Amino acid sequence: GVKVERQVFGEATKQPGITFIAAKFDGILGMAYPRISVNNVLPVFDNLMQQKLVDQNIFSFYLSRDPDAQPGGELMLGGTDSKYYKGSLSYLNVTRKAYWQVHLDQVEVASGLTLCKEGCEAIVDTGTSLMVGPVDEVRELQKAIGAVPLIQGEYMIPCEKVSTLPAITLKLGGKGYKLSPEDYTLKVSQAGKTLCLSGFMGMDIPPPSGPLWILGDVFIGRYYTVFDRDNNRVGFAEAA
Amino acid sequence: GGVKVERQVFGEATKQPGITFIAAKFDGILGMAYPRISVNNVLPVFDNLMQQKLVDQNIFSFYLSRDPDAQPGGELMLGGTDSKYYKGSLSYLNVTRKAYWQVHLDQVEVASGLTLCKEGCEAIVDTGTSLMVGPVDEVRELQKAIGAVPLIQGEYMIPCEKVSTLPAITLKLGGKGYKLSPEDYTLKVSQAGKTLCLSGFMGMDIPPPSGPLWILGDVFIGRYYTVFDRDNNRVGFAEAA
Amino acid sequence: PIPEVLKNYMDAQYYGEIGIGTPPQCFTVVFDTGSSNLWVPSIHCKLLDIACWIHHKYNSDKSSTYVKNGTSFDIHYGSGSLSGYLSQDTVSVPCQS
Amino acid sequence: PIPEVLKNYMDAQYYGEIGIGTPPQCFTVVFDTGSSNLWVPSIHCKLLDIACWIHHKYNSDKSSTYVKNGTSFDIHYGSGSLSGYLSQDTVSVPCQS
Ligand SMILES: COc1ccc(CNC(=O)[C@@H](Cc2ccccc2)NC(=N)NC(=O)Cc2ccc(OC)c(OC)c2)cc1OC
Ligand SMILES: COc1ccc(CNC(=O)[C@@H](Cc2ccccc2)NC(=N)NC(=O)Cc2ccc(OC)c(OC)c2)cc1OC
Ligand SMILES: *[C@@H]1O[C@H](CO)[C@@H](O[C@@H]2O[C@H](CO)[C@@H](O)[C@H](O)[C@H]2NC(C)=O)[C@H](O)[C@H]1NC(C)=O
Ligand SMILES: *[C@@H]1O[C@H](CO)[C@@H](O[C@@H]2O[C@H](CO)[C@@H](O)[C@H](O)[C@H]2NC(C)=O)[C@H](O)[C@H]1NC(C)=O
Ligand SMILES: *[C@@H]1O[C@H](CO)[C@@H](O)[C@H](O)[C@H]1NC(C)=O
């Protein structure tokens, strides 16, 4: 294991609302760049790098998309784990060093709809459960797949339609990253009933940070992700 | 056996905005209050059942289990009461306004000293309200007396370890005391494998002319078997089995 | 007297089975002393109504005792609201299917 | 390279175990590439904070490598917000208790 000495962190005393009550986890360990650190605190991975605790300044995520699976995921500090991906890693350069931001060429719905037509900015976020895109564009995407508004930018799709939905392809670094309908939908269950949640949420990210699409757990789960601080790049490979 | 209420007018729901009805275990609602509050002045099921003389006694009663594991979860008796689900004798209160099942509440006493509804107030007996409901300012004062903290939307949580040392809360109706122990007025809730204790009292003001009103919800009916009598316009209570 | 068994979901929802129509179409309902209308989801519910997707729906075409009405209704509770139209039929307690 | 196992809750929350302090006090955290701060609940959380009743809490008094800071912080995500104060200590990945 690793021991990161003299790390500055927050002792939370107030958590208003219900946000953190049901959450399975105790806290958050941020892994983005120092630029967005509240109080300009040196982040864990930055301290880890300055202390030379790993030979390679990269970290990687495997996220399982089956909640029954063992393990539920794996973070590799200082390397990648070939047991959780197939083929080779394809890299994209970080375009702004704050979030792990990359250039998104376009978003294609197999039935015809094109979003982010002339290219846009996107972030790779393990802490966002869903794919997030601009309100108006996500509204168009949801109409193309027959999804209906639920609440707060989220949409539901009749479960019987999922098998016949078009695949959605994200073009990054000139390559297509396809999400099949099983990949972009989530099966949700409450009080002995089941529903299918759209894995795309509409939310506008205001400037100066936004507009931004967010490649959340839905995307990372299908594509094993490498975060490289040595070369300021993000790598993707098909997850095992 | 059963009952068949002929020519009943009911609603075919086509729109249900928001998330309210999505998670609900039930498909619909069958209202059992008075015709006065019926939307579109529709003759309610029990009124139609009475007009058709399908029962001998124009009364209906509820047993509600407070243990979710128990079989049955509850029992509605149409045209009677069921002595297997109550002990002792029924005590009756006159309905004060025939719209909801409204009765006069003499006062609310917290064992530790606090008195709410000091000079008497109006209350309704509602099987469709999960919790006890009272005015925001008075419930806020009750929650402070039991060490509960605000959750969201008028609801409060109590540290589970404090429940055993909480005072009893007594509702005075028809000159008699109806005690709710901390076990009766708290609900054990588990979300993502985590155990929290919800206070069974919710603060919400119901605007006049209908309000102010306290609501004796499932928390109360669960401890006190309830009889709704349309023949004499009264509500009966007995200790639940 | 007629007994109607109820189910208990989390000490929050108490409901039982009823029938509407000839032959009876079964529905679970909260017998609610705080309101006065009976309603169930319609087979004609709007696509936008997610709750309808996973609840039983009344089909007037399958009932020989269905009498058309069609008058609009809107019901609001403390919790939320709903709308639709009125119909007339036989209500069975319990379902008796 | 150091592997850190993660748990998956409903394809929505991915989290692993870390340690803070000497000896390490174990916490579960989301390793979050969309933010840059580390935080855990404090043993000094306010009574009003219901989330901290059922989550692990850091106790600075039990750590020999705890270094007082005390500067206030306020973090806003998209989901919601939180506040507290800063502290300094050794962070272990995995917990290594
Ligand atoms: C002033 O605001 C508030 C006032 C009062 C309340 C709580 N009490 C009610 O709302 C009563 C009506 C009432 C309103 C006003 C005064 C006296 C009675 N409700 C009912 N009797 N029946 C239903 O609601 C049907 C129903 C629907 C959905 C259900 O779960 C998904 C459900 O599960 C059991 C039952 C909340 C407020 O706001 C939070
Ligand atoms: C503009 O409005 C919205 C904008 C965006 C979002 C969704 N995305 C985020 O909020 C990102 C931050 C971000 C904000 C803006 C731009 C780029 C990144 N969040 C995180 N990376 N991390 C966390 O939030 C920690 C956390 C906390 C609690 C959790 O469960 C209870 C949890 O479970 C996994 C994780 C929602 C909005 O509103 C709904
Ligand atoms: C408490 O921790 C904060 C961390 O934010 C310390 O202040 C930072 O110090 C670093 C260099 O060590 C700077 O790059 C940051 O800009 C500083 N942040 C702020 C907001 O000023 C701070 O010195 C520590 N000590 C005390 C007593 O507060
Ligand atoms: C549809 O049903 C409504 C509701 O039951 C009927 O109108 C009500 O009729 C009763 C007497 O039968 C009156 O006491 C109510 O005041 C009436 N309500 C309203 C809002 O007018 C109505 O006649 C039925 N028929 C049609 C075709 O709408
Ligand atoms: C990515 O960045 C490296 C180093 O800054 C540079 O050599 C390379 O050409 C960049 N790639 C693209 C596609 O711009």
Swiss-Prot record, chain B:
Residues 1-238 form the Peptidase A1 domain. The active site is at 126. Disulfide bonds join 117-121, 160-197. It comes from the Eukaryota. Glycans are attached at residue 94. This is Cathepsin D heavy chain. The lineage of its organism: Eukaryota, Metazoa, Chordata, Craniata, Vertebrata. The chain holds residues 170 to 410 of 412 of the full protein.
